[PDB]
């Protein structure tokens, strides 16, 4: 997922010695970041797992797990990145067209195209 309206921001964080509070013990580390808000080109392929129609009962609970993951990504958004504990790194999928391609009728031509919101 490459970025388009990105912007690199540098943040400098230093520690505070517990004894004699306030002194910087020289652990001054500066890290690079992306701007809070920038589009990313997301593309994902899933094979042999119907989502728009779903599978009846064969190897099920995998479609449910995938839908749960997608719902978490869309509404809440997962945490990725280097720090991931001080809030650095929280991606979210705003909108995504879900295009279904079926082999027998027409694989190149999409069968059903729907927005991801209706899928979940």
């Amino acid at each position: 997922a490459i970025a388009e309206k990105y912007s690199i921001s540098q943040r400098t964080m230093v520690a505070i010695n517990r004894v004699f509070g306030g002194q910087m013990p020289g652990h001054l580390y500066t890290l690079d970041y992306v701007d809070p808000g920038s589009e990313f080109s997301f593309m994902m392929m899933i094979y042999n797992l119907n989502l728009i129609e779903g599978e009846k009962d064969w190897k099920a609970k995998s479609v449910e797990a995938l839908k749960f993951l997608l719902a978490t990504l869309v509404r809440e958004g997962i945490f990725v990145g280097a720090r991931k504990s001080v809030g650095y790194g929280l991606i979210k999928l705003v909108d995504a067209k879900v295009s279904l391609y079926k082999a027998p009728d027409h694989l190149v031509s999409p069968v059903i195209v729907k927005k991801l919101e209706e899928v979940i």
Partner: protein
Amino acid sequence: DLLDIATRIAISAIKPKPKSNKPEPYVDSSTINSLLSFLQSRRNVNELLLYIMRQAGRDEIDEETGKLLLASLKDRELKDAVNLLGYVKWVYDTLTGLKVNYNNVKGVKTFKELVNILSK
């Protein structure tokens, strides 16, 4: 080439700082890293030139160094600007780490001449 311009501007910026207790460059690496960070964050050339001019007015940047930077970045694309700034930062870092004397690099105009001087 961009590298020749980068070497020339780094040489102009490695001039000794007048009226200093110790022999040190007139321009510090912190300024160069700030230039890089500002260009990455703002992602434009106009306010980058504005910041360069403000720094030059507030000392810490040689007048000829600022003039060369302004002439180089007067009309340049963002990618070309960041490439030039990265080259300048690397050349300045090399000069500082090598503790190269200014008087021996007052006549270099290209990158090949500087490379030969460093090798010999």
